[PDB]
Structure formats: C-alpha cells, structure tokens
C-alpha cells in the first residue's frame, strides 16, 4: 500500500511498503532510487483507489 512519511527527515516522500513488521517498515522512495526503513508510526497511508467505475 502507498504511504506518506509524516514525520522525520523524509517528511513528504511517497512510497509503497515493501516489507512491514510490528514496529518498523521498509518503504521504497518514489523519487530516489533507494528503499529505506522507517518506523511504522511515522507512516500515513494515502492509498490510490479509483472512485466511479461506470
């Protein structure tokens, strides 16, 4: 699922959670070509649905 870093030095970046755990979680940064490991509480799901479908 797509998330958004709400706190910390990477505040603003968007990424998809690759590997999640009970505390930390690995997120791949959309801009930079590197995957980081940020705490789960620091993330905020933004999602990407598609209302309508008609």
């Amino acid at each position: 699922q797509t998330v958004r870093i709400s706190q910390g030095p990477y505040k603003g970046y968007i990424g998809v959670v690759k590997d999640a755990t009970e505390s930390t979680a690995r997120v791949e940064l959309h801009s930079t070509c590197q995957t980081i490991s940020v705490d789960r509480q620091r993330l905020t799901t933004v999602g990407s649905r598609r209302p309508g479908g008609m």
Binding site: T2, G12, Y13, H30, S31, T32, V46, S48, R50, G53
Partner: protein
C-alpha cells in the same frame, strides 16, 4: 470496471481492448498501441 484503455500508435486515439481480443485500433487499423499513465500518486522531489 476497467476495460483497460490503450492509445493507438499513429492515430493517438483511445481504444478499449479486453482480454482475448485483437490488438488493433477502432479505426484505420494498426498493430501498435501504448498504454495510458497510471492513476497513482506520482510525486517527485525536485532534487
């Protein structure tokens, strides 16, 4: 309800191609067609 939309090669018109169907444009009739940009949150860091 996503019939998967494609863009023709030379005509640049939108086409609805479902599974088990030929890959051709609704008009003229070509065998090339690209996809459309995703709907995800394409966000960049002007860095």
């Amino acid at each position: 309800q996503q019939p998967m939309i494609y863009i023709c090669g030379e005509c640049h018109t939108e086409n609805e191609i479902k599974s088990r169907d030929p890959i051709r444009c609704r008009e003229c009739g070509y065998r090339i067609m690209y996809k459309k940009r995703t709907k995800r949150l394409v966000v960049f860091d002007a860095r």
